[PDB]
Design a protein around this ligand. Sequence first.
Ligand SMILES: CSc1ccncc1NS(=O)(=O)N1CCC[C@H](C(N)=O)C1
Ligand SMILES: [Zn+2]
Length: 140
Amino acid sequence: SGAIYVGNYRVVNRHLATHNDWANLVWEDSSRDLLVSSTTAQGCDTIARCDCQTGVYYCSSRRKHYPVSFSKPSLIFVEASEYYPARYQSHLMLAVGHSEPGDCGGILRCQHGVVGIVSTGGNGLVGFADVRDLLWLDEE
Ligand SMILES: CSc1ccncc1NS(=O)(=O)N1CCC[C@H](C(N)=O)C1
Ligand SMILES: [Zn+2]
């Protein structure tokens, strides 16, 4: 579990969105595993606007933040899970690191701010849904 709180927005994995998230929906995209809802209080996270390929992510299954090297956002095949059928997920970055299903939502960050959230994994890999292209998270 986990979310990004920037401005009056809450960014979560689409597959983990609550009924309150859907009832206050701003934008969702199943191909990216992302959903954004509106919030009453202002959040403290800042979004990175950069092309870093190194950063640090939070792994809840280890209670630890790990430094990682990650690939550029791409279209990657993701196997069938209890949340989606086998499909191509877009804007996904891969890294070598520990992950378990419940680790989804952990933040990946660089020196500039939040880069994305854990979305996929398995066998010593972890995948992150990038958010750096969503410029509208910084306004309105
Ligand atoms: C951190 S997710 C994870 C980690 C380790 N083993 C396995 C997994 N699970 S998964 O990769 O099948 N995942 C399950 C939840 C939905 C995800 C999606 N974005 O399509 C796919
Ligand atoms: Zn950066």
